[PDB]
């Protein structure tokens, strides 16, 4: 219900270190948002989507981050891939909405924008809504690394190459996930 500078924010987080905003109870209207041509996608799960809000809910969480265009499809219940496995995981029973839009004009630079990162290697998948910003060296072989990076001992985060002349599938997209909490104590 102050969805203003969630979407407006000049500044968005890497997906591995995704941001979170807590939004409790006030006046929240989905009549313009849902139909805006300014978003490339906006899809709701567990909600009556094109029947919009007659929901009520106790808290709403807004998670925001940047990924590559062809990875937006991983921000959905039951998906797999580096992003859904190692970076941002939605639960199967997810209840909420996924909003994304092309941010090539903000987030890609002529030399490449190496500020946005994602986790490439992880010992196991994340549980739903977990956020892992650890940077232990990834042991890819059977020999321990002891914090060196040589061969089979990899820094776990990789940078996107965001480069403005690439096709739209390789371009950066800003994502906002709205989770509708509810629980049993309103």
């Amino acid at each position, epitope marked *: 219900c102050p969805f203003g500078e969630v979407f407006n924010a000049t500044r968005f987080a890497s997906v591995y270190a995704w941001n979170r905003k807590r939004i409790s109870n006030c006046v929240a209207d989905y009549s313009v948002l849902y139909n805006s*041509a300014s*978003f*490339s*996608t906006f899809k709701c799960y567990g909600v009556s989507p094109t029947k919009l809000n007659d929901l009520c809910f106790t808290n709403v969480y807004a998670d925001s981050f940047v990924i590559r*265009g*062809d990875e*937006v*499809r991983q921000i959905a219940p039951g998906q797999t891939g580096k992003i859904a496995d190692y970076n941002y995981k939605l639960p199967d029973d997810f209840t909420g909405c996924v909003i*994304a839009w092309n941010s*090539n004009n903000l987030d890609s630079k002529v030399g490449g924008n190496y500020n946005y990162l994602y986790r490439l290697f992880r010992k196991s998948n994340l549980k739903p809504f977990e956020r892992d910003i650890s940077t232990e060296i990834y042991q890819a072989g059977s020999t321990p690394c002891n914090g060196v990076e040589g061969f089979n001992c990899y820094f776990p985060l990789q940078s996107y*190459g965001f*480069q*403005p*002349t*690439n*096709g*739209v*599938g*390789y*371009q950066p*997209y800003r994502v906002v996930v709205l989770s509708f909490e509810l629980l049993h104590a309103p």
Partner: antibody
Amino acid sequence: VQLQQSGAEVKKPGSSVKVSCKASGGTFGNWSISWVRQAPGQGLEWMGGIDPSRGEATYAQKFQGRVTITTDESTSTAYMELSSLRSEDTAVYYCARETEQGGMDVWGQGTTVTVSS
Amino acid sequence: SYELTQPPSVSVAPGKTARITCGGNNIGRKSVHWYQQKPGQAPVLVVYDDSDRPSGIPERFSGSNSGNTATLTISRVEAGDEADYYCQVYDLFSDYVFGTGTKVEIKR
């Protein structure tokens, strides 16, 4: 900037074909490459594409598992390999440059592949 | 989006205005492209980013995109415009999608 494709191919069912696309702009630059096909009397069908400087290719859902797209850095040449060919892979195959706004810009001249016994 | 629907053909008298529609859910959120194709030739991009013309494409080709329909408009149609026309978008879940194609014929 311009795109030269290899010549026509005739293939038997079950075999594979490897088609090439050589950019005349000298080098691949910073732009993406898609492969598109069109069967006789039918429409255009995206098969996949690659960022030549990123080295990882992506593929349409169908075709996943029997198409491989690669690029030759030094020669400024893209490749599309389709295997386990079947009659209905008879088509003209195009490479094309992807645009910044979501389309395709420069098209190769097309490569006819006929699959038959 | 995912599927793009085009009429199989439009038939237009010479000098009149041809309108080729392209339907898709919320196509207005996508960047529509239009290609002209003649027999034995590669597609030629004629309108990009909903309404922009590449250099060398005649003034008479125009595009629009709003809501659930995109449209290619060809003013003062002449025989040189006889061809198949494809609309096309990038969808985040289906990748590059082409319409089924519309054949423009000159009415007579």
